[PDB]
Design a protein around this motif. Sequence first.
Motif, PDB file in Angstrom:
ATOM      1  N   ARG A 105      -8.906   7.331  -0.230  1.00  0.00           N
ATOM      2  CA  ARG A 105      -8.387   8.691  -0.218  1.00  0.00           C
ATOM      3  C   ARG A 105      -9.003   9.458   0.927  1.00  0.00           C
ATOM      4  NH1 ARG A 105      -7.373  12.743  -5.369  1.00  0.00           N
ATOM      5  NH2 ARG A 105      -5.183  12.137  -5.690  1.00  0.00           N
ATOM      6  N   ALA A 116       0.805   3.687  -2.514  1.00  0.00           N
ATOM      7  CA  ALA A 116       0.419   5.085  -2.352  1.00  0.00           C
ATOM      8  C   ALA A 116       1.488   6.050  -2.882  1.00  0.00           C
ATOM      9  CB  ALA A 116       0.114   5.379  -0.895  1.00  0.00           C
ATOM     10  N   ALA A 123       1.055   7.212   5.706  1.00  0.00           N
ATOM     11  CA  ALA A 123      -0.248   7.265   6.344  1.00  0.00           C
ATOM     12  C   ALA A 123      -0.929   5.953   6.022  1.00  0.00           C
ATOM     13  CB  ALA A 123      -1.065   8.413   5.819  1.00  0.00           C
ATOM     14  N   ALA A 124      -1.149   5.719   4.736  1.00  0.00           N
ATOM     15  CA  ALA A 124      -1.695   4.452   4.292  1.00  0.00           C
ATOM     16  C   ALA A 124      -0.954   3.286   4.966  1.00  0.00           C
ATOM     17  CB  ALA A 124      -1.615   4.350   2.785  1.00  0.00           C
ATOM     18  N   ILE A 141      -2.344   3.512   8.495  1.00  0.00           N
ATOM     19  CA  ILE A 141      -3.745   3.221   8.765  1.00  0.00           C
ATOM     20  C   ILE A 141      -3.922   1.719   8.632  1.00  0.00           C
ATOM     21  CG2 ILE A 141      -5.923   4.565   8.602  1.00  0.00           C
ATOM     22  CD1 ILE A 141      -5.224   5.763   6.227  1.00  0.00           C
ATOM     23  N   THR A 153       0.832  -1.220   0.000  1.00  0.00           N
ATOM     24  CA  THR A 153       0.000   0.000   0.000  1.00  0.00           C
ATOM     25  C   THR A 153       0.858   1.257   0.000  1.00  0.00           C
ATOM     26  OG1 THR A 153      -1.437  -1.240   1.559  1.00  0.00           O
ATOM     27  CG2 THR A 153      -2.077   1.027   1.032  1.00  0.00           C
ATOM     28  N   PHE A 184       2.382  10.916   3.110  1.00  0.00           N
ATOM     29  CA  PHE A 184       1.128  10.397   2.572  1.00  0.00           C
ATOM     30  C   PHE A 184       1.179   8.868   2.535  1.00  0.00           C
ATOM     31  CE2 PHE A 184      -2.054  10.810  -1.254  1.00  0.00           C
ATOM     32  CZ  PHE A 184      -3.075  10.333  -0.448  1.00  0.00           C
ATOM     33  N   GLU A 211      -9.995   8.493   3.613  1.00  0.00           N
ATOM     34  CA  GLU A 211      -9.273   8.077   4.822  1.00  0.00           C
ATOM     35  C   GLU A 211      -7.963   8.852   4.954  1.00  0.00           C
ATOM     36  OE1 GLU A 211     -10.965   4.819   3.951  1.00  0.00           O
ATOM     37  OE2 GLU A 211     -10.985   3.695   5.834  1.00  0.00           O
ATOM     38  N   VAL A 212      -6.861   8.262   4.478  1.00  0.00           N
ATOM     39  CA  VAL A 212      -5.518   8.876   4.506  1.00  0.00           C
ATOM     40  C   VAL A 212      -5.493  10.416   4.555  1.00  0.00           C
ATOM     41  CG1 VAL A 212      -3.914   7.137   3.532  1.00  0.00           C
ATOM     42  CG2 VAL A 212      -5.517   8.301   2.041  1.00  0.00           C
ATOM     43  N   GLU A 213      -6.308  11.073   3.737  1.00  0.00           N
ATOM     44  CA  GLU A 213      -6.347  12.525   3.767  1.00  0.00           C
ATOM     45  C   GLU A 213      -6.884  12.959   5.123  1.00  0.00           C
ATOM     46  OE1 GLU A 213      -8.493  13.749   0.280  1.00  0.00           O
ATOM     47  OE2 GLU A 213      -6.677  14.024  -0.902  1.00  0.00           O
TER      48      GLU A 213
END
Lengths: 306, 306
Positions: A295, A257, A277-278, A281, A253, A274, A297-299
């Motif tokens: 998107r 990403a 993050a993925a 998460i 991921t 970024f 999500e991560v954002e």
Amino acid sequence: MNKLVVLGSVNADHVLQVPSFPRPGETLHGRNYQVIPGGKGANQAVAAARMQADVGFIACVGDDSFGINIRESFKLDGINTAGVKLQPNCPTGIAMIQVSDSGENSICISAEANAKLTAAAIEPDLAAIRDARYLLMQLETPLDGILKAAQEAKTAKTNVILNPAPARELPDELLKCVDLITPNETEAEVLTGITVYDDSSAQQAADALHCKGIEIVIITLGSKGVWLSQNGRGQRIPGFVVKATDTTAAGDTFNGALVTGLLQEMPLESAIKFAHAAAAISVTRFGAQTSIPTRAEVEAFLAEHS
Amino acid sequence: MNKLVVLGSVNADHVLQVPSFPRPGETLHGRNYQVIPGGKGANQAVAAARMQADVGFIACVGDDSFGINIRESFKLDGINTAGVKLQPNCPTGIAMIQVSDSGENSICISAEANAKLTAAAIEPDLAAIRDARYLLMQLETPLDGILKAAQEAKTAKTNVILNPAPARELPDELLKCVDLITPNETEAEVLTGITVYDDSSAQQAADALHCKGIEIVIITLGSKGVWLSQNGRGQRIPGFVVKATDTTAAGDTFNGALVTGLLQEMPLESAIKFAHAAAAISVTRFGAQTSIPTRAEVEAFLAEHS
């Protein structure tokens, strides 16, 4: 037409829980059997596509009705399945993992349909290769195929990305055609011969890598950083103090990403946060395709951490 | 309503050739993986169908893109898919058979849908079981599922044959409901205490069965032939001058055909011979549930021998 291209290996992982390891002669009665779609190319593209990317997929699957259960499963999650071709009478790749679950995991992997990703196998996909702005690949497909893809791009310009996973060894003539590389410590070593463990040795790898025609080198250092180097400018990104969960895609991921960053004009360092993050998460998540966040999500996550 | 009724398991055999017996830790790049339809209960009802018999199947499959395709596959082979109870949110049952290229094997069995078959699950199937002339069943599904099946069969003057595969120790209460028994060397010790290897020892184990209520006792020993013990008045039978390669569906074809015989009024003495052919033809074919010949094929074969 399209703008992002993934070139890789789809493959189903057959999961079954046993009371112990095997041995010659008898048989084991198992429990909780499940099939989780997997394989880098498949992850590092469903990873992308959920972040709305303009993505296309190049992989080879079989006609064993699953092989078809994935060519849609894909196609829905954004991805352009044009270059995912059906191999007749070959099944899509596999993993038979008898579980310990009493210790460690016995993995038996085939490559089956994934073995048809060759030079002549994607002559029609070169169109998409060139007209694409990027290209993503891992090493679960044959080099012969991983190669023409790279070469067709470089000549008609397109930055090219390679996840050195799963770990092996590459010819120089190829790494020259890569415009990045995102190895992992234990892998990364086999590509140069430099055991990565701290900041100073983390640098030696890069230059050794760099020296092979590679612009950017981002060796995942796992639970602590993402060694970035743009022609030798080595750094560190402290990742995320979170509550981890399984291995699964994570590096699928993450790498999935990081490319979703670069397409939306982000500078690398902006993406690596970024990506992480993925990578932060869905590591509270599990499974495979089950982990990958959207998107939205991560954002949101990026916002929730500051 | 169908004349013969089979009650047993279904499998999917995931075979992938391994070049080195599995060990802890790292993985393995095996090759040539095949999915071969299987399961004792399933071979024999497919064996039966191949000998142009009136067979219905009572078994459990799952939602699986197999457990549906297999049920549709049954009918194209002439099967009463009545009792082929399907299973929601569950996979079928599977065998993970790892080769070793060579050395020894790693068959790994998974429970799954071959488990729903409990006394309670076959209740509307008494309808089928009672009015049918024969009942063929083995030991790869729950014990309490069979136990009820045997008794209401007997109380409804329906003959019951018990293939004790795979070999296990059994309680009485049930063996009083069997009309015929089909074990081997390995099966006997688990129920009669006898290691049985020749004619003097073969008469003795049988009796124990006889002493547990079993009339016709057919102890088959693949290579050397079958010892019948029809109430002590017993003899030795040379099963065709042949081999055994995929014995998988061998003792499955034997059992499928033998009951297919008795059903067409053949004398006991002659049907054991009948099966011995199909097994002898089945054993020469590579594959598992594909190693099963057609009736003309077996019948013609019979002429060519004597």
